[PDB]
């Protein structure tokens, strides 16, 4: 007989930032 | 060994390093030590190196195995540190072989700047494979990059990229030309000399494609005995970076002589220079009235020489941010001290350095440090190898007495208006392939000017080539006629005089 | 390798060495005190330090067993997997006598729990700390961790029961380096002339590997260098001398630095003319500290650290900047005015902390801050982004130079052009202690400068520079410069002249009085009259507080 | 053009390969088909006795493990081994998913066998490759590096249609009275499967007309599927695009108060060249080289599709004469002009583009813009014009038979067309408020005067 498998790894997020002018 | 060119020196020690481990092992039994076992390749990308790197691994007795930077990784947790695995294990298991992990920026992040914990969790692979306990057993690896910089600390040690080579002129050129077409005969009248002097900005990747693209050219052409390339062919590849030979500029001759001496001397005798025991100067700076052909006597003297020509704008560097201004002027400098020689173009000084002095303010502390990265650019802790800034603005009087000091723009060399003689040879510059007309007079056109600017002269004979494409859909005089009444002269008065005054000052000092 | 192969760190090699061994070998001291030891070590430092270089040396001469980790090895990308590992291993680890387990790289395994969006990686770390700390956690089973960023390791981790002691496993000091130099050049036959003493006490920032990396260049150097003179006598005649040494230092650097390396000027002491006074402070300044700690020990005082040069331009502060790079055994780290800024808010305070850490890290180090206008300049500008940043960055100058440190001998040296401008915290004591002014050189100051520019080129026998050096009276040492490249210049062209003609048909191995004449017609006296007006002043403000 | 290329790139390689090998070149060995290209291949296939071992993408994965890689290179030795011939990968973007979105493994190991497995044919395997596909973005740039596939052809006929459509619909009792070649005319972009839904439904339609194939049947089957200003400035863009031997042996501006944007919408429907349209403030970014670096991608955008019409709209908004304004919006506005100067006095007699500017107020436009060698020319830009405006804005609409627009034209003087479309809306607002407001299917089915005389009530000038 054959049987399955379960797996979960990781995705992808997104970051903000600040940044100063003059 | 035979399909490398330019790259001797490291071409040479890479051999080196590799040969006397696999030639005789005897030689570093007897000295007690063991060989470098990493080759860290950093450059522009399409010089050679990956090439040089398999002529290493096929004229040696190894296996080259090929791991590529964005191919191993991926989402899946576990999986890029595997095949990392797989494939050291794979080079260690049958042979002593060489490793070529290309583009090893991109998979070392250096730990702090990046977010993903999978690059964070190979870069640790990679220090665990390179170095350990019983990490390597004969064995070599090699690396490649564009920005050596972005590598972390522990991956540019010793025993993992324990050996950082530079890849990145003219006689290798050349050679690259021979053993490129080396398979193939090309013709009889055929000289090289010219196809290494007019491909001065090519990395070495792209001659190959050039001569690959003549031969298919020649043959798209032409459709087996007396078959090749021509002469065309390679100017046809070579068309498919400014197209003057000092011929362009008109008058100006002793300040032409000048720029040629003081550019061509450093270039063609550098051993004569080294007996002398002298460095030479760099830096030339033209002032006086707009549209005087400044720029165009800059790249008269850029095309001669087998430099670049980098020619940057003065409000085309500053920017809102902090820092952006001086990160553009550092990215300048170092794309110019980057492949020597080359002739840097600043234009607008006036406009740049703004004679510092004190603002307080915010665009005030800005030109502040815009000047100071600029003087510690030129001349500051620095080499100095082959840097030929010459500058161009309209206002000598609003630059700092700091960059006008010598060593970095030492030649305070003035452009005046031309006179009749010298609009005569512009005249005689601009038309060089036109049909012309024997009743016409340069001459009668000339001494009408009276103070007109080369604008204006290539403004007038646009109007003729107007004139005569409209009489089309050789050139008349009857155009020159009709053109010579609608003239401009766009220059005043007052900044002859201001600018003649200003020359006097800078003689009477 | 074995305890033995292991140089240039007693204390942590004791530290390691007694938990590792006594309890293993006399447990019935812990049996008599009735409390157990301590069985966990975090080994950290600065990569290449030679902490996996102990572990391996413990592991091959203590007789128990040792199972060894990786950090990534253990991860996979089924649910249930890597803890699975970590349980395999520690489950057979503890089955057999006691042992030792290593887990490399633990900073990669285990990062804070809070600070990470994924699940795996807090399902391992959980299963790391039930694993070491648990019901039954360990009988006689000991566990040593290495990493080089140990701020980046879940605080939950570093308590006792999981890593009792943080060992600090550092650079070593020049007696370390002194044992590392031995025990590295034990095995290859070394040439009686050179001497290690001197190697170590030159080398200062180079850890380890360094060293080792140090060593195995010289020998390639020797052999190179043989290999090619030459086409079973030859392994005879095999011995690495003390010059071969000196390439290798003189073309290395630590591997903290290298990305901070310069590229390599020649200049020295004599290439400077003139400012004999200045030259002979900055050298006293310089050398005393590092060639004679005893003395400065002994007296129970702290030796003066930063320096600043002012003056018009081009008169050489960047010449004697070089010259210290060249011939000085400290580090150097060079940087230019701008050159540590960003747009980005709390970054440019982080160049200047990065790079202070490293120069204190690897010291002693001189850090040359050049056009300190651009960074300094003076705290409370005209408010909002005028000194919004401005502000950060001299503040963080200010906590990093004088403040809550260790006196670690980091000489910094400036180099302005309008100190007026430069902020008052800056230039106290203690922080920038000397002020110098660099004047314009007086006549005889500008015959050393002539000299000293004309060392290593041709010159007429009958020729004299005196008249060269009064007639200019105003002069800079650019400006002489100048004058020697445009005289340099003539006699070239004379030269290319000359052949030319023998072509068509050395003729002047020297240059000459003419050259030096027609060279000189056109001279510059770059540096105004109020310039000089306005340095004047401000020396003389100085003298007057002084 | 393409047929005519791809038959010498199919003839030339693969039958003197002797006089291949004597020129010296070896780079002609693989082309590809984006945009009848499985026709093109089929003729191919049919014109040659050489080998043809046709591969689809897709049809590369079986159960066992690294047989996609075993069938790969079986595919290449079968190839090389029998003859110089030609291969078929038909659908490559399955078999290459771009390498970057994708997260499998085998996929990446099947990308790298046919990477390396295409550029290890050497000079005795004189083999060539033939791919096609449908979308020409998703395809690795390192499959499109020079060595495996580097000559393309864009295939954007009437005869291959007649072709089609008389090998489907030659398996039917079909009519007497039927002419093919107009169906093969009137039909356009159809392409392969469209034939064959159009004779489907012929089909259908004949089998309804019989229930409650002739010619009407595939008619409705297909029916039923899917002065001196302008002349001058017409003349003057062809000749400029036009051959440039006699030119041997670019911009233009508009100004005035009446179609300027109108004219170039007609440039752009009707000159048979590209166009690229951005507004004024469009471009725009508070960012030190984002609003530079959209001008810089927009002008390499235009040189790449060569030739081309930048349609400048509003140029004052963008220009606004650098001078000196001392700011951050002065500094973005010289930062602007200089990029726009930059990018646009770098174009030679090569990629022939072509700026065309518009504005209202002349006056704010900078001179050295208006500079000659850059932008040169000068259009200024009526009751004809106006009458021709309402009347090619009525086309589409139900406009009531007893009315007259020359009133409407005298009476409006200085105004515009955006207004007289105002004046069309609200007419059409005002007549749909009516209708809201048995009678037959429309109570007002034609706009009356009355809406016309209630619109112009409120209509203003621009
Ligand atoms: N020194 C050289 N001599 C001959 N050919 C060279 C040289 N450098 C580069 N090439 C050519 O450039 C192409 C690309 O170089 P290669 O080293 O393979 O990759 P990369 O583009 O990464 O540098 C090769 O096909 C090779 O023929
Ligand atoms: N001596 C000259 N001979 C021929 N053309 C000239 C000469 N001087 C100027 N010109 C023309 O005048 C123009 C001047 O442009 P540019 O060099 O950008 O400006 P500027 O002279 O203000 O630095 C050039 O395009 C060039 O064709
Ligand atoms: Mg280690
Ligand atoms: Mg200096």
């Not at chain 2, 990784?73 to 050291?88: I, P």
């Not at chain 2, 401009?488 to 002859?496: F, I």
């Given at each position: 007989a054959a049987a399955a498998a379960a797996a979960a790894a990781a995705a992808a997020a997104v970051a903000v930032a600040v940044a100063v002018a003059a | 060994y035979d399909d490398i060119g330019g790259c001797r020196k490291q071409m040479a020690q890479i051999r080196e390093m590799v040969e006397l481990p696999l030639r005789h092992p005897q030689l570093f039994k007897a000295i007690g030590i063991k060989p470098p076992r990493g080759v860290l390749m950093y450059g522009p990308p399409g010089t050679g190196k990956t090439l040089m790197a398999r002529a290493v691994a096929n004229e040696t007795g190894a296996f080259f195995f090929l791991i590529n930077?964005?191919?191993?990784?991926?989402?899946?947790?576990?999986?890029?540190?595997?095949?990392?695995?797989?494939?050291?294990?794979?080079?260690?298991?049958?042979?002593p072989a060489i490793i070529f992990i290309d583009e090893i920026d991109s998979i070392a992040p250096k730990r702090d700047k990046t977010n993903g914990e999978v690059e964070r969790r190979v870069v640790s692979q990679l220090l665990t494979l390179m170095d350990g306990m019983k990490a390597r057993s004969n064995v070599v690896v090699i690396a490649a990059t564009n920005r050596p910089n972005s590598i972390d600390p522990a991956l540019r040690r010793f025993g993992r990229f324990d050996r950082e080579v530079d890849i990145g002129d003219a006689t290798g050129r050349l050679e690259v030309l021979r053993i490129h077409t080396k398979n193939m005969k090309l013709a009889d009248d055929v000289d090289l000399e010219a196809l290494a002097a007019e491909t001065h900005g090519y990395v070495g990747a792209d001659i190959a494609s050039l001569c690959s693209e003549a031969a298919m050219q020649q043959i798209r052409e032409k459709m087996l005995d007396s078959l090749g390339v021509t002469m065309d062919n390679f100017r046809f590849a070579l068309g498919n970076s400014v197209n003057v030979?000092?011929?362009?500029?008109?008058?100006?001759?002793?300040?032409?002589?000048?720029?040629?001496?003081?550019?061509?001397?450093?270039?063609?005798?550098?051993?004569?220079?080294?007996?002398?025991?002298?460095?030479?100067?760099?830096?030339?700076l033209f002032y006086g009235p707009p549209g005087t052909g400044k720029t165009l006597l800059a790249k008269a003297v850029a095309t001669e020489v087998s430099a670049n020509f980098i020619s940057v704008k003065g409000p085309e560097l500053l920017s809102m941010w902090y820092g952006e201004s001086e990160s553009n002027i550092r990215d300048i400098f170092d794309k110019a001290r980057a492949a020597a020689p080359t002739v840097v173009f600043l234009d607008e000084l006036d406009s740049i350095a703004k004679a510092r002095g004190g603002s307080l303010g915010d665009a005030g502390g800005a030109s502040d440090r815009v000047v100071n990265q600029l003087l510690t650019e030129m001349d500051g802790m620095n080499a100095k190898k082959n840097v030929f800034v010459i500058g161009a603005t309209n206002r000598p009087d609003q630059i700092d007495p700091a960059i006008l000091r010598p060593g970095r723009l030492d030649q305070l060399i003035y452009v005046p208006l031309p006179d009749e003689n010298a609009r005569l040879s512009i005249l005689?510059?601009?038309?060089?392939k036109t049909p012309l007309e024997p009743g016409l007079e340069l001459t009668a056109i000339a001494k009408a000017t009276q103070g007109f600017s080369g604008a204006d002269l290539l403004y007038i004979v646009q109007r003729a080539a107007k004139y005569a494409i409209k009489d089309s859909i050789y050139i008349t005089k009857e155009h020159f006629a009709e053109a010579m009444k609608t003239a401009?002269?766009?220059?005043?008065?007052?900044?002859?005089?201001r600018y003649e005054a200003y020359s006097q000052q800078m003689k009477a000092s």
């Open positions: - | 930077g964005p191919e191993v990784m991926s989402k899946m947790a576990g999986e890029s540190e595997s095949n990392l695995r797989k494939a050291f294990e794979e080079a260690e298991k049958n042979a030979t000092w011929d362009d500029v008109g008058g100006l001759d002793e300040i032409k002589e000048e720029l040629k001496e003081t550019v061509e001397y450093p270039v063609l005798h550098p051993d004569q220079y080294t007996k002398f025991g002298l460095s030479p100067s760099k830096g030339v005689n510059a601009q038309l060089r401009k002269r766009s220059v005043s008065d007052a900044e002859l005089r």
